[PDB]
Amino acid sequence: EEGPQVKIREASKDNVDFILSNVDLAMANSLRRVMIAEIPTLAIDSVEVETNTTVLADEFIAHRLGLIPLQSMDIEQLEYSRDCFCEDHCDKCSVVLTLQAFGESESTTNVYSKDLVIVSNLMGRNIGHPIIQDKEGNGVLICKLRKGQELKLTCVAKKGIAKEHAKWGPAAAIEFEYDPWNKLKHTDYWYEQDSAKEWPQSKNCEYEDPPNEGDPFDYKAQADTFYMNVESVGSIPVDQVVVRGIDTLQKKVASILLALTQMDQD
Amino acid sequence: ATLKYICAECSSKLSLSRTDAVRCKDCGHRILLKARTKRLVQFEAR
Amino acid sequence: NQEDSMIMNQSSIDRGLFRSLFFRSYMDQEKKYGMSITETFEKPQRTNTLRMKHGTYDKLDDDGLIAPGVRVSGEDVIIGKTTPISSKRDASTPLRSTENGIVDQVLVTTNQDGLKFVKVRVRTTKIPQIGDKF
Amino acid sequence: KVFIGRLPIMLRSKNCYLSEATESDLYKLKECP
Amino acid sequence: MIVPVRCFSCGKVVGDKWESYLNLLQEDELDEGTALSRLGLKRYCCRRMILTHVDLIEKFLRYNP
Ligand SMILES: [Zn+2]
Ligand SMILES: [Zn+2]
Ligand SMILES: [Zn+2]
Known part of the structure; x- marks a missing residue:
């Protein structure tokens, strides 16, 4: 050219x-x-634990939910919570994922990048989908748990670059x-x-x-x-x-x- | 609906107040843990 | 990295590299006095004495303990106990001023002679910083 | 026939429960294998 | 102690590849050396990651409440 x-x-x-x-x-x-x-890009940046009995401690898990890559195609049309005017955050600045696991199986129950559930309205746009390249379609094993080990969180992915964090x-x-x-x-x-x-x-x-x-x-x-x-x-x-x-x-x-x-x- | 304490071994939401003995309603195992808070705790995600 | 000190990839630290947990355990019992005089695990206040602490007692429930989920810090009290002598002289246990973190597990047992014996355990994650050693 | 004091017992010794216990026994005892 | 998500060094997702690697060993009677080349883990920064991880978590789960 x-x-x-x-x-x-x-x-x-x-x-x-x-x-x-x-x-x-x-x-x-x-x-x-x-x-x-x-x-x-877009990633979970705030995690509100309601319940956890796993062997991994709260933040341990949180930390991870951060690296769990999420969909950021139209990230260029979502806003930096910091620049948006909603006291704290909104559908216009963030995605809300959910996680809830219970050990039912008598055999180690596994929590994956897939079990994340968007709750906020994506006002129609590819963003917030736990990116999976896994062959079986489960991606990134968040954590395992025994008999009656529960785990209920809530996530809030926001914009953000690498300088801010990896x-x-x-x-x-x-x-x-x-x-x-x-x-x-x-x-x-x-x-x-x-x-x-x-x-x-x-x-x-x-x-x-x-x-x-x-x-x-x-x-x-x-x-x-x-x-x-x-x-x-x-x-x-x-x-x-x-x-x-x-x-x-x-x-x-x-x-x-x-x-x-x-x-x-x- | 609601609880307070628990049993280390026979995990079973127990609870009692002053001078109601510090044993479980089953396993003597005089232990007893205090189960989480209803308050939601939040974490930085990095 | 000059002089026996190293440069350390930040990104790596973010992605986890070398993070670690850190627990500490404060403990306490309800004293006794031959002539049936005992201390108690409660969330005290005025009641004459004031000889108490300076940190927020609020994080304290009523058995005189914190909930395993609470985020503590400064000198917030972690245990509420009181001494009877002749009416509210405090004997609570504040968190090591320097440290801070999250309550991780309380537990209340009986001590041989049947007294209220308890141990609190705070958890913390410590990330590699500039002054750390390896 | 008579009781005279107590002998603190070294762990994992003969006279220690953990001695004969196995994998599963311990984990259930909470004691690490 | 659960598979690290992503490589400390280059950041390439690696949380998924756990089970897969564990099988390309047990079932697919393969050698670690390549079992990894298999999973796409090229350069060592990532190799070292899986090859070394010690999934203690299991031993943890085998406890109780
Ligand atoms: Zn907003
Ligand atoms: Zn019991
Ligand atoms: Zn790498």
Whole structure:
């Protein structure tokens, strides 16, 4: 197209190996990071225990309900409880899940990411669904319990990003590499006898022209073409963790212009 | 509807007041736990 | 991480890495006096003395105990007991001023000579902070 | 024929209930296996 | 002591993979080494997670009230 191109190598529902080409390392990383920590998601953030007899103590469980990824497709149309005006929270700012388990079976009763029950009105929008990729469709084993062990909670998922806390992260890992044949000499391989012998060459050594002695040191050498790979957790589709990444990082850069503006007036 | 104490072994919602003995209505096991609060407790989720 | 101290991945701490629980157990009994004079587990007040505590007694039910679900903290009382001497001199047990947490389990048993013996147990989760050791 | 004091008993010893008890016995005794 | 949800290191969900791994061992008479590669757990940060977890919770449940 126009500026920094892409060229998706493999790709799936849980990963997007692609080649970011014709960009500044800076920008590549910036995006790298944005993905990792500032993309809005949705997660349980408040847990009201009414009853619990499990062996796991209250907060122990709570903590977990946080990492249980939830649906965050339209998270971009839900509000940050903090910016909404409802004293505390509302359907306009949050989702309300529920959990109730009782050991009936004479055999260990299992509580899963599935047993969560949305109670608030989703005013029609994909959000708040305990994301399941589990093969049997149960996902994330919240906790087990014996004979008559009960457990009644209530959850309140809200917006929120990674900086605020991890559970709101959506990325989880992100392969990043460039210049597979150390050509700009950005590293200084350690060795005993041979650099090449001891140090494994990467999958990406291919997609780039090997060194070849003779030639002098390319010092004018810049650095474009980055072999990335944005995995995903679910909360948002692999593709998203990259587009919304590219976006947020953009709005961020935006606000800086906007700020510079109000600045003028006064 | 409502309770107060319990039995460590023979888990059974018991309860009594001053000088009503500190045993269970079944198992002597002079233990007795105090069962949760009706008050709902809340937790930060991180 | 310089000088025998390390940098520790925050995200990891969030996701759980190294969190731990911490319990403490305060305990107490109803004293006795050969000549039938006993102490008592109740939620006292005025009644002349005032020689009591400074923390909120409210979290206290009436047997003089907290409910296993309560969130305590400062020097909130955890046990209400009183001493009779000649009329309300307090003998309650406040939570270790430094610590704070959630009541986790009360229990009332009889002590050999039939006295009201009780133990309270507060639970806390402690997350890795900047001064912690490993 | 006569009672003379009490002998604090080392746990898991001969004269200790837990001695002969098994997995299930303990867990029921609350005592950890 | 229940399966950690997500990996301390990279955050990749891992709460589900418990039972599955436990079976790709018992029933599917497979070796941990790959039983994991099976469950998709590539790099060690995640491997170490399952491979090491000690599901004490069971031993806990075997108690009473
Ligand atoms: Zn609101
Ligand atoms: Zn009983
Ligand atoms: Zn990992």
